[PDB]
Amino acid sequence: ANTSSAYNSVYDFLRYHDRGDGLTVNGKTSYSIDQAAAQITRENVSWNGTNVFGKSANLTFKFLQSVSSIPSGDTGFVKFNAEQIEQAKLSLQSWSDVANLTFTEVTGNKSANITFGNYTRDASGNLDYGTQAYAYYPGNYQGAGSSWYNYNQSNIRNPGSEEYGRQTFTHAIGHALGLAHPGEYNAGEGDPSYNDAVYAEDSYQFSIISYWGENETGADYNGHYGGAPMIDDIAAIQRLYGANMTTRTGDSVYGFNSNTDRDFYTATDSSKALIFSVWDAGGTDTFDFSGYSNNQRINLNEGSFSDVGGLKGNVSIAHGVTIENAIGGSGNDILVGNSADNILQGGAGNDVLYGGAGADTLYGGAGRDTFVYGSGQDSTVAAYDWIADFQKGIDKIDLSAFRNEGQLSFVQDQFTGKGQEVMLQWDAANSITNLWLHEAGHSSVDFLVRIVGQAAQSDIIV
Ligand SMILES: [Ca+2]
Ligand SMILES: [Ca+2]
Ligand SMILES: [Ca+2]
Ligand SMILES: [Ca+2]
Ligand SMILES: [Ca+2]
Ligand SMILES: [Ca+2]
Ligand SMILES: [Ca+2]
Ligand SMILES: [Cl-]
Ligand SMILES: [Cl-]
Ligand SMILES: [Zn+2]
């Protein structure tokens, strides 16, 4: 049916970066999260051995202070500096947050599963200012789990201020845990490019084990590097070691006002870029994106991507995660809930809110806001939505999606029985307006949105 542009914007955003299911994207086969995860783990190796899946591990790590040799043949060893140590520990933590891994530092002569060191020259003893980093897969051989970084790169020496350095630590540790590049390519071997990718979603938007920029898949991080595991990385590492169900099991806030004590989930002011895929194992959680003025699009569905703070495709939610609440900023935003009971706050600006299934509580904020309903299942009597700050003559409630079963008619105080009728009923004692919809094919009146405030018939879009 002809539906409104507000509904169409929800319908489209729900399908942003659709994947898998026999789609073709960028002329390549599109993989699901799980297909991408299987591809990233295709070497079938982990610290637990070969072809061992879903098994936790307790691992050691060490910052080498000297070496007998570097397993690649590079030379000019330099130990990690203090900033590299701090950032590497943050990278390790970002992996142990999502998978069932513990990391324990060892020093002195103790062997370690994962090691860190820098190099500066090739096997011929000439300075190497061109390469970046590499690491070795788990195994029982000499050098297994070791990771190596070019100290002549400023991003490697300064990973706390040069985002690519922190990303590189996360990437290399991923190899040291058993993850592979999503395609058969490597640095030094020819000149690969995204054109050589096996599947469309081989980019930083989905995996920081990729070589390819997030622009290759239509995302845009405005020159930033995220630094922590992205959505397919989380699925991949959980395939090997199991998911960590102890992480952030309380009510967690991501974005502004964050309580995660993780830099990559925290924006401290509006100039801060956020790039993350969230893992969260319990509790009632909030995406607080309130500090931005850009028009944002925020989706709470697991697996989905959001456009946050002026970037594109920079936030996603890992498979297995339920995030319950979202707060937009002063821009004109779209906030899309999931089947849970969501509290959505549009903030200032003219926002479109869609609770989806479940009993949602919606605040448009200042501005001309639109609360969208796509199905009778979005607001059943048994689990109805509240719209708590509705402004008569300014906000709108959009029922245009119901046109697909016949144009809805407005009735004043009684239903005829014909169905596809909408009624507003004012409760003067409580100052509540109940919006009732008797839907085609329903014998009883089964859709209700309760509104804290008055509403006019002309505020209801049918
Ligand atoms: Ca939580
Ligand atoms: Ca939750
Ligand atoms: Ca807003
Ligand atoms: Ca919902
Ligand atoms: Ca608003
Ligand atoms: Ca409003
Ligand atoms: Ca709902
Ligand atoms: Cl030169
Ligand atoms: Cl839903
Ligand atoms: Zn790599």
Curated annotation (Swiss-Prot):
- Quote the catalytic activity from the record: Preferential cleavage of bonds with hydrophobic residues in P1'
All disulfide bonds of the chain are none
Binding of Ca(2+) 1 occurs at 248, 250, 280, 282, 285
Could you tell me the EC number(s) of this protein? 3.4.24.40
Binding of Ca(2+) 3 occurs at 329, 331, 333, 346, 348, 351
Hemolysin-type calcium-binding-type repeats, residues: 327-344, 345-362, 363-380
Q: What is known of its domains?
A: The Gly-rich repeats may be important in the extracellular secretion of this metalloprotease.
Q: What is its main location?
A: secreted
What cofactor does this chain's UniProt record say it requires?
Answer: Ca(2+); Zn(2+)
The protein's superkingdom reads Bacteria
Report residues binding Ca(2+) 6: 356, 358, 360, 378, 385
List positions binding Ca(2+) 4: 338, 340, 342, 355, 360
Write out the residues that bind Ca(2+) 5: 347, 349, 351, 364, 366, 369
Q: Which residues bind Zn(2+)?
A: 171, 175, 211
Concerning PROSITE patterns, the annotation shows:
HEMOLYSIN_CALCIUM, ZINC_PROTEASE
What name appears for this protein in its UniProt entry? Serralysin C
According to its UniProt record, this protein's enzyme class is: hydrolase
Q: How is the cofactor bound?
A: Binds 7 Ca(2+) ions per subunit.
Q: Which Pfam families does this chain map to?
A: HemolysinCabind, Peptidase_M10, Peptidase_M10_C
Residues engaged in binding Ca(2+) 7:
365, 367, 369, 395
Catalytic residue positions: 172
Give the organism the record lists.
Dickeya chrysanthemi
**What would you give as a GO molecular function for this chain, any one?**
calcium ion binding
GO BP terms in the entry: proteolysis
Residues that coordinate or bind Ca(2+) 2: 283, 285, 322, 324
Q: Does the keyword Repeat apply?
A: yes
What does the entry list under GO cellular component? extracellular matrix; extracellular space
